[PDB]
Amino acid sequence: ARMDWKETPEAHVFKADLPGVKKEEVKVEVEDGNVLVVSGERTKEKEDKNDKWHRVERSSGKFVRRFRLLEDAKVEEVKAGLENGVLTVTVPK
Amino acid sequence: ARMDWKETPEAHVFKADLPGVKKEEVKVEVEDGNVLVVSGERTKEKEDKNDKWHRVERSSGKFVRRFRLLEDAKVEEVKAGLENGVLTVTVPK
Lengths: 93, 93
Hints:
The PDB classes it as chaperone. The entry lists the keywords alpha-crystallin, chaperones, heat shock proteins, single particle reconstruction. The structure is a homodimer. By secondary structure, chain A is mainly β. Chain A has one domain: Sandwich (Immunoglobulin-like), CATH 2.60.40.790. Helix content of chain A is about 0%, strand content about 55%. Chain A contains no helices and 8 strands. The first copy, chain A, has strands at about 5, 10-15, 25-30, 35-40, 55, 60-70, 80-85, 85-90. In chain A, a hairpin with a 3-residue loop joins strand 3 and strand 4. The first copy, chain A, is elongated and about 55 Å long. The interface between A and B is medium-sized, with 30 and 30 residues.
């Protein structure tokens, strides 16, 4: 899962490309008090044998991403939005 | 634009991971009767000019892709939808 890490005067913002992932398959947490953990699964659409695959380039499966936040970050004020296959996490400073 | 091409008995289904892309930035055309063409370019995020970029992995650009259909497609029957970062092009056989 490709992620960007930008910083605004107000907060550190994280972005993650998660095409084809429903919000029920993504988990956003804070472990050990200051470690942002973005994880989930990009479910494989196995389907039936009637089908035929001519090309397969898209990946599927589990993904895990961890960033170490500041020992003094609004851990209780972290927001997480998901739209158009892009996840956005806002960690207030 | 990682893409998959599946051939169910009913139609040809193409998938393209285009996270954070808006329909005004993607284009699905048909050339010479049997050539599906997918192209586009994710726009610059009109996000806070001045932000600090700690890490940038998501780095998309222009691209064009073409597939040779097994049979001339009835262009008025071709459906294309964009959702959760995934472009889907269905071609009825």
